[PDB]
Design a binder for these strands. Structure first.
Length: 225
DNA sequence: TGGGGGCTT
DNA sequence: AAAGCCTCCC
């Protein structure tokens, strides 16, 4: 409906590439249709539409992102995320519910990981009191993408990592049978190990986790122990 | 296991 | 912009 979205849809479509669509789609296990438009082209095409229509008012950004999210081809969600980054300064704690919706719709690692450690990680840093309003809820939801969100929001924290909170969240999900949860646990631990390898090594040796998670967690540090 | 064209700095 | 890195994938 929104002219900006429809313009973007027609522009993207005119520049699709079936030869690139196949491998891109297979990378995501065929959960999505792809136009076959990679990042440099996708951003240029977005740029073109912005040059013509200009970037919409901040009070419209959510409608545009939702309309893009509803379109079949994956690049439209990738473009929606490019757009959200442009409005980054206007995204705050009142947008958590909107972000939850994006996380649980058209869900896969590519969209969820693009939302969580950046947007949500920044938000909880700025609004510490909201962690208890969201994280326990996400863990208990049995929606694996919200559960992944609770694990990964601190991914980029480095020295800001709240270790007790991290290990609490992991402990809550350590028995999950979900592939993308075991992976998220391994990832956050592997990433945090670049800052504090000793504590991650100890945690992995001394606590219950899926073998998958243990392997992912220590893949870069095992050479040191 | 553990390293990879597409992506990033 | 030369070169390191990889969520994921296999």
């Amino acid at each position: 409906m929104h002219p900006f979205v429809k313009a973007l849809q027609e522009h993207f479509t005119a520049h699709q590439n079936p030869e690139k669509a196949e491998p891109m789609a297979r990378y995501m296990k065929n959960h999505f249709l792809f136009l076959g438009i990679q990042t440099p082209e996708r951003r240029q095409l977005l740029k073109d539409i912005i040059q013509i229509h200009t970037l919409p008012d901040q009070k419209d950004f959510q409608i545009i992102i939702r309309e893009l999210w509803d379109l079949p081809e994956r690049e439209f969600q990738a473009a929606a995320l490019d757009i959200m980054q442009k409005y980054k300064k206007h995204i705050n704690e009142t947008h958590i519910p909107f972000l939850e919706e994006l996380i649980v719709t058209k869900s896969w690692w590519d969209s969820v990981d693009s939302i969580v450690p950046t947007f949500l990680g920044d938000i909880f840093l700025k609004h510490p009191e909201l962690i208890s309003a969201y994280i326990p809820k996400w863990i208990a939801s049995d929606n694996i993408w919200l559960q992944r969100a609770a694990i990964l929001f601190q991914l980029k924290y480095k020295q800001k990592m709240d270790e007790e909170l991290l290990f609490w969240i992991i402990g809550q999900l350590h028995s999950s049978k979900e592939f993308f949860i075991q992976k998220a646990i391994g990832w956050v631990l592997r990433e945090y190990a670049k800052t504090n390898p000793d504590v991650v090594w100890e945690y992995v040796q001394n606590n219950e986790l899926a073998p998958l998670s243990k392997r992912e967690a220590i893949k870069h540090i095992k050479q040191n122990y």
